[model samples]
Target: DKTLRGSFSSAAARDAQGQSIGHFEFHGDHALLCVRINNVAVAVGKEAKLYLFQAQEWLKLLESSPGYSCSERLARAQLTVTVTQTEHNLTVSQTWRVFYADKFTCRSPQGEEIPFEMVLLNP
Candidate 1:
């Protein structure tokens, strides 16, 4: 039983464009990843959908046929994934990398990308 907290920020070389928070929990082989992201100024009319990056594909959250249980809202999204245990590789600390922009798609009407970064405390 562990808790995973993540911070959202711009995935650019520039200053912070938007900031957000994400929280998660682990249960055996399953984990729930949740994020509450800020709205994009340009993506006002266009709908923003939450996606998870895995296997070189971006899977939509709770999109009927994703196989995993997932959900989303105004600017918040959550999903569950089965995490397979690995052998001892390196003595890693608590925090692990996860989320946003390049990984999560918050796209514009014209297909432009609004990217953010989500870094979790536990992998």
Candidate 2:
């Protein structure tokens, strides 16, 4: 029932191996998972997908799952991820994975070649 939060910064992005981009929260009451990313001045190309790992991996685009919402506000320089789930009970240790085919490197305005990935967990 608790909310989990975390973050991703340019400091970590500068390095090539860093996959963490942000943090998120699992709201049991609403059956929602809110993912947030900062310093998105650069581009988070259209090629991206959100995933959830519960013993097995699942994708947002799966037909079985619906309501994978995302809003990238360049004006506000922020990226928002709100995933709606029918199931309410989730483990605190579960992992939420986000993948960018274009790589969300915060280097150039167009981003860099290095891909950006992150794991969201309880804060």
Candidate 3:
């Protein structure tokens, strides 16, 4: 990939059976994490969100302004993925060296997060 070296390439979640969910991408001032419901790619932070970084501590971005695609050198949102086998809830924690999760949501239904796998398609 010309941009992301790892899963930062708009990587979405997958099922244990290997089905893709949604796509999430990020940059310094902005971020976008989306999950799928019935196959539509829904924006995670459809209303945008506030994040904390080690350098800046706190920042935000408007999802409608302009999409923050991949970048080679920038304070990209680093996500640590964890899925609960209990409910198969996929949680991608975004953080910098400063704060843990400036914004978050359990990618799931009203009761439980979906049970999905993680697949890096761009790779």
Top TM-score model: 2
Best by lDDT: 2
Model 2, 1-123: lDDT tens digits are 234333333334334322334334453422344443443433334232232333123232333344332222111211223222211232344234332222333224433332222333344
lDDT of each: 0.30, 0.32, 0.25
- Considering only N, C-alpha and C atoms within 3 Å, which residue pairs clash in candidate 3? 14-116, 14-117, 15-117, 108-113
**Candidate 1: Cα lDDT at 78:** 29
Lowest summed lDDT across 10 adjacent residues in model 1 is found at 82-91
Q: What's the TM-score of each model vs. the native?
A: 0.26, 0.27, 0.18
- TM-score of structure candidate 1: 0.26
lDDT tens digits by residue: candidate 1, 1-123: 233343333343012211223323333443333333344543333333332333112224325363442123213322222111211112122212233332223221244444333322234
**Candidate 3's residue-wise lDDT over 18-123, tens digit each?**
1122343334443323222221122232211212233232234223246342221123534333221212122333333211111122122222232222322221
Tell me the deviation in Å of residue 37 in model 1.
Answer: 4.9
Candidate 2 clashing pairs, residues 3+ apart or interchain: 19-117
